[PDB]
Design a protein around this nucleic acid. Structure first.
Lengths: 66, 89, 1030, 108
RNA sequence: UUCCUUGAUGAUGUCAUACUUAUCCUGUCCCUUUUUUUUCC
RNA sequence: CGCUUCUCGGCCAGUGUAGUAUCUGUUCUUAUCAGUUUAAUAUCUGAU
């Protein structure tokens, strides 16, 4: 369980849980080709610049911890 | 004292003895064999060539997984070669 | 003494002279170079310790990368006080000159010990130029005795007579005395007590010769005699007492414990069992205490390590288990800082074992943790004895970690090379030996990592005399498989010579070695056939095949192997030809050997090669052996079977001689040998068939049929077996004892109590009631039913196994209602009976006609007030759905309300088993669209979540996992939100455990189902993406 | 011709709590010179005693004849004392002086 | 303006009895083999 | 020994490893504050 990421425990902080689901949101968005294309259409960029941006936002999302 | 090695899942077909022969390994059960067992030659090697994935005797057959453990997708975790929590021999 | 007779078949010593020291064991950056001059200086002050300094500087080669951990490991090795001082000073000089470009006590006690042995041994060296009885000092005497005793004086006249005693022991040994009895309100019953105290054990449990309260520590010791309830007494006592100690782990603390065990795990008189149990206590408490055990660690191994050197296998494996549990349990630097000084300990034993220790601790904490230590050791320049050890360590690492050694292979070797050239011998010897073991785990690989090793080895091969020599072989041999048969080609061609010249030695270590080699050298693809045929064989069969060998165990095996592989190459008839003539050599173990060898060979190569005349010599042989069997052993029997099934219809001329013996033997010779011949038929059935010797099938059918009145179990068993295999060849309607005769004839046997019977019988009955099953009028069957029913008292699994499957077969023959009505007979009043396998009948039955029939009977039968049969019916549903799968899409409704009732309490068990039903249903239905109900049930499940009761819980985990796949997450997760953060601990514990189980599977799905979450000051928890609208 | 376990020590029990070193020294005195004795003077070990001789075979003759021997109305449990165990209350040491001494006089 | 009996837990006790795991009741011996190198056309 | 006649008799209290559930007995609702602890209690730890 532990070496399988996204594992929680009862000490789980708010922040960590949410950052988790961010990241996983992302590897989905890189995953599901369409969903990606959806984003691309909306906010006009490349597919690439999308994926790139995302892979920037990976570690950050929500901003610094507490 | 008795728990999985869960080292990475190789291509080596599993091997079971007389005793263990029917059992879908994790669901302990005879029901509905469908799909096939893989373990690491690390787990499975040498004196372990055709060794029981349980008891330490010679393998006469090949464990099939249940369907139950199938849809719960467990068969794909680390190689179910049970280690006694002493060494494996 | 006779009590010394039946008490010695209780337990027994098992040990050599050698292993009996156990009794003796009393309890517990060029300025990086000139820097090494510095480090050496300062530590040397804080004398002479080597491999310390090397564990220090051994953090060099990762350069830039060495850290705090240096203070950790070193922190234990030296007194953690000086630690800070040094490693601090170091880190300073290192960062800077990086710019500008009790333990100690313990070892002291060792150098003591050997300085002493030097003083004495030298005293008889000049005294010879001129033990336990060694006299004693009062300082020493006080320490040995525990606390709490006065020394005395009776009188200086009293102690003067004592002083006079020896001189007057000879003097008054020769003087006058004799003793005279005279012919002529007692009291004082001594309390010797509480399960029981052997006489010897008084010494330990003496304080249970006192009877008091109000003494506090001493109340903890005096309460820890719970042991004795471990050591001796009744099984239940052992159990309960055992837990009571486990939960009292944290409390009493290790110190008191091990203080009170290690005497017993040291007991000169200890058993087997008592040993093994007291191990159990050491493991079990070692699942708990972690930081705690530190001061005790060595003070443990000293007992345990001897476990490594034991005749009993299961002994060893326990030992290893706990030495990991300790080592991982304690800290690494604990283990090290502990275990240096045993390296140079005079006794080779303690080294030897000390290695295997380090092997284990290394399996625990990984090699690379431990390397720089080893690598330090093998470069210790004080003395070799270490290096002998450190190398050994490499080995036992090799053996244990085995196939997994692979990655650090190169480093390990990079240790060990510097040995081979050493001045001392052993160190050479052992070294190479390790290389061997390595390669034997390196199969096949890492060749060039060994690479720089060879060129000495080959040269070394030339010049040697002795055990070392053949050792180097042990290596090379295990190498060759690893080479390129062009390079390997050459090098091979060199060895097979020395191999030749060396067959002949008297050494057995040798013959093992050179043997296994040939397996490999001529065990090769890139070696030429004839060449073996000429040079090797005739020696081989000459010197090796001899009666020395086979009596021993290993040599037996290793031999068989080798000869086999020479077959796999030069062919079959070659070998077998030469060893046939020895089936008729008298002594068994030998015969047994030739026999199994052949068996394999015609296993692998196939019969097809064999000529004719030789073959006559086979079968004549394989009878002649088979006719004389000391015990009944699988060997000759199988070996035969394979012989025949290989020869196929080449066999046919030979039957009459076979079956002739088969019968003749079969009779007389009194019954012990009978079962054998029986089996012999078992295996050769198929051959009696396809060739179409039917008169034979008349013979067997009927004459076996007679024995089924034989009273010995161990015959009748094999008899039936023969019958079964006879059935699998000749079909039903051609059976010469036509079934009508037979099947009833069996029927009454089922009482037989004895095992092998019940097995082969129910097996047989099964085959026939499956296949023919019409032959026998129904009435007979229903008799069979009411006889089966109590076969379910079987201690064994397999009986019940096929038992059930039969129960089904007949249930097909007749039709269901009755047979479940009949199964439905098992009741809640008893329990062990109709424990479950019966339920399994209800299941399989319920398939084998449309279950769609049977339910109403079943369901209704949950009405009955008798509790345990109620839960029975629940499981019935369980296995039931597990066995039906898709079909559940119907009767689901039927059960659902019932699941509601049972799932609502009466008691746990209802909720447990029922919940299981939910599981197997929930998988089976999957995605046909019946969720709705399953949602409904989810409710009555849900509250069960909370309990400690292991079966109830792992049941529920079962439930919700399956239910996940049926309902889908999103619904689940909608039960698991609120739980996560709930203030309490209890709930969070669980709702997390659930949400994990949801989480791992279907992580990919979730994304949708995390709800919106409002972003706070420092952060944004709203995922803005999804709201982009075109 | 001896079992290895037995040692110059014997555990000795079934004693009265009045009983005399005079009695003791005398009786045990038969087999050989006493290295020394201890008597449990303590709440628990009142009733028992240890005995140690200048030789084992002394003690062997002891556990031989004194086996189950009588004193007062009592029978004395007579056992070869175990060893190792709890002693390490006293740390190993005291070498340095002494082994320098043999180092010195005899020079060896 | 001058009046009744009662419920319940928790903690500590080696009492008592039901029961749970297709657990268990047969597999199983194999690298413990250790010594101051020392087997002669 | 065979045949015929007559008389009598026969048959269609197992064991081992892990673990839970449930009764009864015994002790406490009893003075303040400081820490540990708990969802909150409780419980545990000190002195008047």
């Amino acid at each position: 369980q532990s070496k399988y990421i996204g594992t929680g425990h009862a000490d789980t902080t708010k922040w960590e849980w949410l950052v988790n689901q961010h990241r996983d949101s992302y590897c989905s968005y890189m995953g599901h080709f369409d969903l990606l294309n959806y984003f691309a259409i909306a906010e006009n960029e490349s597919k690439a610049r999308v994926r790139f941006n995302l892979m920037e936002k990976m570690l950050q999302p929500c901003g610094p911890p507490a | 004292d008795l728990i999985f090695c869960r080292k990475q899942a190789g291509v080596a077909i599993g091997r079971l003895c007389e005793k263990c022969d029917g059992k879908c390994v994790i669901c302990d059960s005879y029901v509905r064999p469908c799909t096939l067992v893989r373990i690491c030659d690390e787990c499975n090697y040498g004196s372990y060539q055709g060794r029981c994935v349980i008891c330490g005797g010679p393998g006469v057959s090949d464990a099939y997984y249940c369907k139950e453990c199938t849809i719960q997708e467990k068969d794909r975790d680390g190689c179910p070669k049970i280690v006694n929590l002493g060494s494996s021999k | 003494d006779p009590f010394a007779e039946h008490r010695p078949p209780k337990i027994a010593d098992r040990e050599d002279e050698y292993k009996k020291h156990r009794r003796t064991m009393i309890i517990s950056a060029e300025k990086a170079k000139a820097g090494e001059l510095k480090v050496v200086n300062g530590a040397a002050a804080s004398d002479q310790t080597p491999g310390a300094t090397p564990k220090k500087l051994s953090s060099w080669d990762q350069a830039e990368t060495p850290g705090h951990t240096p203070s950790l490991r070193w922190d234990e090795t030296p007194g953690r006080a000086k630690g800070s001082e040094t490693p601090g000073a170091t880190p300073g000089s290192k960062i800077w000159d990086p710019t500008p470009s009790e333990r100690d006590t313990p070892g002291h006690g060792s150098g003591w010990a050997e300085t002493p042995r030097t003083d004495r041994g030298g005293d008889s060296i000049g005294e010879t130029p001129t033990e336990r009885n060694r006299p004693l000092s009062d300082e020493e005497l006080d320490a040995m005795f525990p606390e709490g005793y006065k020394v005395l004086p009776p009188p200086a006249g009293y102690v003067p007579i004592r002083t006079p005693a020896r001189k007057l022991t000879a003097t008054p040994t020769p003087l006058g005395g004799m003793t005279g009895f005279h012919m002529q309100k007692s009291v004082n019953d001594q309390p010797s007590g509480l399960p029981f105290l052997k006489p010897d054990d008084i010494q330990y449990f003496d304080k249970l010769l006192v009877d008091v309260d109000e003494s506090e520590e001493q109340k903890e010791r005096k309460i820890m005699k719970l042991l004795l309830k471990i050591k001796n007494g009744t099984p239940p006592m052992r159990k309960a007492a055992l837990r009571q100690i486990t939960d009292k782990a944290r409390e009493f603390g290790a110190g008191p414990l091990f203080n009170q065990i290690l005497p017993l795990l040291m007991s000169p008189t200890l058993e087997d069992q008592e040993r093994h149990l007291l191990v159990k206590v050491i493991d079990r408490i070692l699942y708990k205490l972690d930081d705690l055990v530190r001061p005790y660690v060595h003070k443990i191994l000293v007992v345990i390590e001897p476990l490594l050197i034991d005749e009993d296998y299961y002994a060893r494996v326990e030992g290893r288990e706990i030495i990991s549990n300790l080592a991982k349990a304690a800290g690494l630097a604990t283990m090290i800082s502990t275990m240096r000084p045993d390296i140079d300990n005079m006794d080779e034993y303690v080294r030897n074992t000390t290695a295997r220790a380090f092997a284990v601790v290394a399996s625990a904490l990984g090699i690379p943790s431990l390397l720089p230590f080893l690598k330090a050791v093998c470069k210790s320049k004080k003395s070799w004895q270490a290096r002998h050890t450190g190398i050994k360590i490499v080995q036992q690492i090799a053996i244990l970690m085995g196939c997994a050694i692979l990655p650090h292979l190169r480093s390990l070797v990079e240790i060990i090379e510097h040995g081979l050239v050493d001045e001392q011998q052993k160190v050479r010897t052992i070294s190479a030996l390790a290389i061997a073991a390595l390669a034997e785990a390196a199969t096949p690989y890492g060749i060039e990592s060994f690479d720089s090793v060879l060129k000495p080895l080959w040269k070394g091969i030339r010049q040697h005399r002795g055990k070392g020599l053949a050792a180097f072989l042990k290596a090379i041999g295990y190498l060759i498989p690893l080479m390129d048969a062009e390079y390997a080609n050459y090098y091979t061609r060199e060895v097979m010579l020395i191999l030749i010249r060396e067959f002949q030695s008297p050494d057995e270590e040798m013959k093992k070695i050179v043997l296994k080699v040939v397996k490999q050298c001529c065990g090769t693809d890139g070696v030429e056939a004839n060449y073996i045929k000429t040079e090797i064989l005739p020696p081989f069969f000459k010197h090796f095949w001899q009666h020395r060998m086979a009596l021993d165990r290993r040599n037996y095996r290793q031999l068989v192997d080798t000869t086999v592989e020479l077959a796999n190459k030069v062919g079959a008839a070659e070998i077998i030809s030469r060893i046939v003539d020895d089936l008729k050599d008298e002594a068994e173990q030998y015969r047994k050997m030739v026999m199994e060898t052949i068996e394999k060979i015609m296993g692998n190569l196939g019969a097809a090669d064999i000529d004719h005349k030789l073959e006559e010599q086979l079968i004549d042989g394989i009878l002649y052996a088979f006719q004389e069997q000391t015990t009944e052993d699988s060997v000759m029997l199988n070996g035969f079977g394979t012989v025949v099934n290989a020869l196929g219809k080449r066999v046919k001329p030979y039957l009459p001689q076979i079956c002739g013996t088969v019968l003749w033997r079969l009779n007389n010779k009194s019954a012990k040998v009978r079962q054998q011949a029986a089996d012999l038929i078992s295996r050769t059935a198929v051959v009696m068939k396809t060739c179409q010797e039917e008169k034979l099938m008349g013979h067997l059918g009927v004459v076996l049929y007679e024995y089924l009145g034989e009273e010995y179990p161990e015959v009748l068993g094999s008899i039936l077996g023969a019958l079964k295999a006879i059935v699998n060849v000749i079909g039903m309607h051609k059976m010469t004892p036509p079934i009508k005769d037979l099947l009833p004839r069996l029927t009454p046997i089922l009482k037989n109590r004895h095992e092998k019977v019940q097995e082969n019988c129910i097996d047989l009955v099964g085959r026939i009631a499956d296949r023919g099953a019409e032959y026998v009028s129904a009435r007979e069957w229903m008799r069979i039913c009411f006889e089966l029913l109590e076969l379910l008292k079987a201690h064994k699994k397999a009986i019940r196994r096929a038992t059930v499957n039969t129960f089904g077969y007949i249930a097909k023959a007749i039709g269901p209602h009755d047979v479940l009505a009949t199964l439905l007979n098992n009741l809640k009043v008893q329990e062990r009976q109709n424990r479950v396998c019966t339920t399994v009948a209800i299941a399989i039955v319920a398939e084998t006609c449309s279950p769609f029939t049977v339910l109403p009977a079943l369901m209704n039968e949950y009405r009955v007030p008798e509790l345990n049969v109620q839960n029975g019916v629940l499981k019935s549903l369980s296995f039931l759905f597990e066995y039906i799968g898709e079909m559940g899409k119907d009767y689901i409704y039927a059960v659902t309300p019932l699941l509601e009732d049972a799932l609502m309490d009466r008691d746990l068990v209802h909720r447990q088993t029922a919940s299981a039903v939910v599981q197997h249903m929930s998988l089976g239905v999957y995605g046909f669209g019946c969720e709705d109900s399953l949602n409904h049930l989810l409710n009555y499940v849900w509250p069960n979540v909370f309990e400690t009761s292991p079966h109830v819980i792992q049941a529920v985990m079962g439930a919700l996992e399956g239910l996940r796949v049926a309902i889908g997450p999103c619904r689940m997760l909608q039960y698991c939100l609120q739980g996560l953060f709930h203030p309490a601990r209890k709930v969070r514990d669980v709702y997390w455990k659930i949400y994990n189980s949801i989480y791992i599977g279907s992580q990919d799905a979730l994304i949708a189902h995390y709800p919106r979450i409002y972003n706070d000051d420092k952060n944004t928890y709203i995922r803005y993406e999804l709201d982009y609208i075109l | 011709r001896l079992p290895p376990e037995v040692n110059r020590i014997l555990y000795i029990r079934n004693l009265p709590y009045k009983i005399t070193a005079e009695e003791m020294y005398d009786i045990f005195g038969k087999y050989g010179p006493i290295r020394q004795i201890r008597v449990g003077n303590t709440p628990e070990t009142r009733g028992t005693a240890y005995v140690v001789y200048e030789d084992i075979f002394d003690a062997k003759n002891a556990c031989d004849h004194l086996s189950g021997f009588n004193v007062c109305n009592r029978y004395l449990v007579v056992l070869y004392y175990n060893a190792n165990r709890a002693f390490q209350k006293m740390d190993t040491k005291k070498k340095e002086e002494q082994l320098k001494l043999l180092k010195e006089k005899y020079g060896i």
